[PDB]
């Protein structure tokens, strides 16, 4: 197929995020858009990404086409992108993936196609007691702040439509409040819930800061946390994180 992205800089950070969880990804180009799906070795995090055709400046996909690529080699190329570079994604005759960056000069990188694993789909239409929406930049900064507290676990607690994120410390703990009242939340729904998730997994998604404008937070007691990082044109990058013991 042939696909083109104008804001390659932002587009790259999606894969720089993925690289925190997986090593090999399977670009599933469908008529509806690019589907990317993966799971970290610990089976703690499940990722579901939809990048609609409308997101791309040029989307030419005749028949569904899957392309497996080593994420490290892919991101290494994507890291060489400027703020003015455009990006092309294409597959030649040998079914290889061709990444073409074009800005100051035109350059093309080619990667050999590899075997792509099949990712079984956990219950996506799952129901969450608590649902919220917030600015990605806001949520991210709050997470990067929780990380510096010095903990391995982060507690998500919803009470009266308000979300409290807390992480333990040598002395005690620190809790950051998010809600419609303090501007942390854009909207809040559902009842109350409390769970503890791995901090590293939550933090590792912060790289979605640039590509995503708003994020939707959903979870429950002893049920997976879902962070949906909204992308332009109806796109989204979903991260499911299993609760703690």
């Amino acid at each position: 197929m042939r696909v083109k992205v104008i804001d390659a800089d932002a587009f790259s950070y999606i894969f720089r995020t993925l690289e925190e969880f997986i090593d090999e990804i399977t670009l599933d180009f469908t008529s509806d858009g690019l589907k990317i799906r993966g799971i970290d070795p610990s089976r703690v995090t499940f990722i579901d990404i939809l990048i609609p055709a409308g997101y791309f400046e040029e989307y030419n996909v005749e028949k569904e086409e899957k392309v497996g690529v080593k994420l490290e080699d892919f991101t290494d190329v994507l890291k060489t992108v400027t703020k003015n570079d455009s990006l092309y994604l294409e597959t030649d005759e040998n079914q290889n993936i061709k990444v073409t960056l074009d800005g100051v000069y035109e350059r093309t990188f080619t990667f050999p196609s590899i075997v792509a694993s099949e990712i079984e789909t956990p219950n996506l239409n799952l129901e969450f007691p608590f649902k919220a929406k917030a600015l990605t930049v806001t949520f991210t900064d709050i997470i990067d702040e929780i990380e510096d507290i010095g903990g391995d676990s982060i507690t998500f607690k919803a009470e009266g439509g308000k979300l409290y994120l807390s992480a333990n410390s040598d002395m005690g703990s620190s809790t950051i409040e998010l809600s419609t009242e303090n501007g942390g939340l854009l909207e809040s729904e559902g009842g109350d819930a409390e769970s503890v998730y791995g901090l590293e997994y939550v933090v590792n998604t912060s790289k979605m800061r640039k590509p995503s404008d708003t994020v939707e937070i959903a979870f429950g007691s002893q049920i997976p946390l879902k962070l949906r990082y909204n992308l332009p044109q109806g796109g989204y990058a979903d991260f499911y994180i299993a609760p703690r013991a």
Binding site: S166, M171, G172, S173, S174, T175, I176, E177, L178, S179, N182, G184
Partner: protein, 248 residues
């Protein structure tokens, strides 16, 4: 259990820093009328008092009076987390000791710490009961400057006051110092019931005056050969009190 909320973490932390020769351990006393610490130096010359009247305590839940001995350092660690001046401190009693909480409505953040404390009998405020013939109010920056002055000369500081002038004098090996405090220069207020005079340790006086700089409304009172009282208030209500015994 005992609950207490103070409208300022910054001020609470400023008062603690004022405690001279803390010993790294204090006995917080919780009473119906106020929370306070009462320290007296070994030489018995200086008494340091940290006090927060109930009038400035929000959601103050007091069952029975209690005194808790804690490590003042642990108490400072948590207060340091306060980033804004609009921060708030909440003290909660526990079986093991204290639970100090610092929350700021601005960024809607909180911070906990469980300080290991040894509770005990409550101490009482046994302050010198005497008529302060002379009282005046001045910015702490002035007292700190005078402290610097006294650092250059003097073994004893003689402070006196006539109708409307307060004088501080010292002597040492021929050298001499003598400053004059009048109203509006710099005294914000001066009240003299009668001409009074007294002498205090320049060493203690210096240490105290340097600390009063944390307030713009420091009140100093004294009389004929009676202990000197120094009040260091804060905007939030918290207050340091110093009693200095005279040289007779």
């Amino acid at each position: 259990m005992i609950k207490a909320t103070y409208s300022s973490a910054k001020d609470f932390y400023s008062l603690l820093s004022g405690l001279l020769k803390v010993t790294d351990e204090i006995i917080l006393n919780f009473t119906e009328d106020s929370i306070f610490s009462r320290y007296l130096t070994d030489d018995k010359v200086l008494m340091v008092i940290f006090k927060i009247p109930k009038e400035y305590l929000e959601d103050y839940t007091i069952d029975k009076p209690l005194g808790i001995k804690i490590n003042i350092n642990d108490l400072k660690k948590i207060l340091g987390k306060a980033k804004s001046k609009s921060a708030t401190v909440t003290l909660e009693e526990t079986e093991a000791g204290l639970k100090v909480t610092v929350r700021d409505e601005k960024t809607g953040t909180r911070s906990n710490i469980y300080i290991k404390g040894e509770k005990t009998s409550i101490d009482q405020l046994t302050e010198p009961k005497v008529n302060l013939s002379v009282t005046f109010t001045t910015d702490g920056d002035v007292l700190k400057d005078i402290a610097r002055d006294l650092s250059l000369v003097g073994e004893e500081v003689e402070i006196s006051a006539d109708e409307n002038t307060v004088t501080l004098s010292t002597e040492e090996a021929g050298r001499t110092y003598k400053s004059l405090l009048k109203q509006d220069k710099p005294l914000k207020s001066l009240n003299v019931e009668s001409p009074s005079k007294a002498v205090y340790s320049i060493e203690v006086l210096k240490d105290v005056f340097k600390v009063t700089s944390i307030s713009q409304n420091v009140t100093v009172g004294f009389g004929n050969n009676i202990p000197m009282k120094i009040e260091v208030p804060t905007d939030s209500g918290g207050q340091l009190i110093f009693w200095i015994a005279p040289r007779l």
